Symmetry: D2
Subunit: 253 residues, 4 copies
């Protein structure tokens, strides 16, 4: 089995979102041990109990801000002291907003760009230090977005940040190959979530459906394949790429 991730430790940021939950559950279901973090601890204790109960894998929870480097480092040290080495980092931290181009302020910018671009970078740096010390030839997966190359209205800093992370992915792959660490991205299209429930089920968003070739928004399960590929031996010869999962959304006329 080339997609085997059993007994690995998967570190997942942005773990309290619907996507964060799905990812953790996917890897626990495949027999991987899970390290989940988010800003607020209470949402993770819940996910933790469920995962331990359903799958019996090891689960570690950490509350921290992904932009707090010393917090991430302190998380890794805490893991190292318990004898744990991270195999795969999944950078899934992400915030956005909807504002006209001229209405975004410096505060909006710092929040969106630091969360979507700076934080994955910091986290990758620290996890890589940790992997290198343990001589572990792991993997890094960046959750980007089709908005890293496609555009939409009202989401300018998000687009900027995603595009930055996509190119950073390529550069990281080039600079980290010497440590045997591959670095790749997965770019989802529009996923049906509650943060954009009003938007998608509306009539204006329903017209989007008719532009998307599969006539369907992205389901979490659509991500399963690429996630397992990029986190396992199956993906070891692959580095520096971005896999779009969008039902052809980005290729539409």
């Amino acid at each position: 089995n080339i997609f085997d991730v059993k007994d690995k430790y998967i570190l997942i940021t942005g773990a309290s979102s619907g996507l964060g939950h799905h990812i953790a559950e996917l890897f626990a279901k495949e027999g991987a041990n899970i390290v989940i973090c988010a800003r607020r601890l209470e949402r993770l204790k819940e996910l933790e109990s469920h995962i331990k109960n359903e799958y019996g894998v090891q689960v570690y929870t950490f509350a921290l801000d992904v932009n707090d480097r010393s917090a991430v480092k302190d998380m890794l040290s805490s893991l190292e002291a318990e004898g744990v080495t991270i195999d795969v980092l999944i950078n899934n931290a992400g915030v956005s907003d909807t504002k006209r181009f001229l209405d975004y302020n410096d505060e909006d910018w710092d929040k969106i760009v630091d969360t979507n671009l700076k934080a994955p970078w910091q986290c990758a740096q620290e996890v890589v230090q940790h992997m290198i010390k343990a001589e572990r030839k792991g993997s890094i997966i960046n959750i980007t977005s089709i908005l890293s190359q496609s555009t939409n209205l009202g989401v300018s800093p998000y687009c900027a940040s995603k595009a930055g992370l996509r190119h950073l992915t390529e550069v990281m792959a080039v600079e980290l190959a010497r440590f045997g660490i591959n670095v790749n991205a997965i770019a989802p299209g529009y996923m049906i979530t509650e943060i954009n429930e009003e938007y998608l089920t509306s009539e204006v968003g329903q017209q989007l459906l008719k532009k998307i070739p599969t006539r369907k928004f992205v389901e979490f399960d659509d991500l399963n394949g690429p996630l397992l590929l990029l986190a396992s031996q199956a993906g070891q010869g692959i580095t520096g790429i971005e896999i779009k999962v969008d039902g052809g959304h980005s290729a539409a006329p």
Copy 2:
């Protein structure tokens, strides 16, 4: 198992190359039935026997020119009459040469471009008609090359044809979605093969190795994961993309 291909029928063009053999053996090992074709049938006979004996799957062989539309059409008819419907087409036919930009002629151009771009298009058209006829929601995988976006010297018609195929993959993904058929590409880097042993093991090619981030040419095994992804349920939400498998070669420092 979301990567399940058991009992599917996989159609593989260009099956007589080392890569084609590898692909055939990969899907057979995963319990899938195999349809292989190439120009010379005799080049397929060992593989058929190995596969029947070792994996116990169905194997159909066909001799044809990938540029012969009626031959492809006749093959598909023959499969239908045996109750066989193709689940996945893997377009893996590919030729090249090495010539200065100005030394390539009309004959070279027609050979390289018709084989690399026109034939996969013909096969896709015919396989799609066959799938539709059987009301089947299948998959198409185009083997391109990192040369669909990167350049090299002495391979201009190959680069043009691969970029052509890459964009056609995207266009087909859009136009075929209505039939439940997803269309994707795999772009290998330089694979350690025997048609290019001299190029790769030489001085000019050994300098190439140090440019590649992993400092390894592409192994056939590197392709297994993407192939299984794009041929199975795991990949159903994915259409119109090209997965590069190159150890970072195309990202390498300018």
Copy 3:
């Protein structure tokens, strides 16, 4: 004046089209000499007179098929014997159609792909030999289309050939640089011309307008700048690129 093209010889294939007429008139206006070819000599005679009369530059006409290498070569030899050396090749031969993906046949494929991709390649080879023989460091400009990276319905072989020509432009730049020849592309969006008046004035085309950021189809004049840039000293440090002229069409949400 870095955009100077006075006294150059500009070779324009596809000269009988609306765009071809426009390009010819553009360069004549700038004091450049004009070599135009198309299949039917009579459509070029009107253009020839119009140009000779208004601008007083040299005009050479050739009736020939652009897919005929021997004809193209004889045209050049003919020019060489008169002491004329081409400075700029503008590859503007291009035909298309509108058919469902499964309705395009082998004949459609050959006409479309040979004219849009094979011919500019043949002409480029022949023009380059002509330049090399005269020890001349000229330019090649391939007219592609935004459909070289974007998609639309019913134009599958056109898209393939344009994407092919786009990458071919990059490869040619690399391979012809040693002869001092730069190679670039201009990719127009949907041009308000007479060859696609029905598509654009239809309702499927009116829905296009509100999607395009400038709310305008492309005017021929929008190409003037890129044409003069890539044909003059102004463009000498530029090779291997494709300039999109489309009012943001390829970036639209």
Copy 4:
């Protein structure tokens, strides 16, 4: 003359660099008025006198940090109060460094990413408000780098920020079309300047020269054509693009 910029006001950030001086002189030479800023007012005065003396155009200088949003805003208000309206914003702000991937710290990141990406975004926002207030249909030009899509070692945050700026250019193009403002980028390759004498004039860098198809580093003059195209009427039908000026470097094998 479709490239006319006579009497326009061109706003140039990063004006104290070698490139900034060149851009100021280019536009002054073409009869356009110049608004230049840099951190230290003293570095701008030499240029100011030279331009006022040689071309006799209006020159306005401002000391500011391009990351200081309120200072940029005050500059524009100051200009508004004098009856001046900016026609073209040229974002020419850019800093970098050389460090292995894991050696870059939070302070480096902030300096590089805020200067290369956040600042042009702030300036663009402020300048658009200024244009809209004056009902003026101008242009924005972002100086990116071929490193917005290509990679190199030791420059990871620069790559991120430039890729960020590249996609932001496309997004802004879409969102600002409604105001008659086009947004484009110029991506130079490696420029032979005095600020980078060691990497380039040495032999370690000389192996790159053999990689570049033209065998030439980028000269400032190579940018002249694209700059005038994108700042004038010649470029009005163009929005959302990046013009690479690199002698085919990014296309190299």
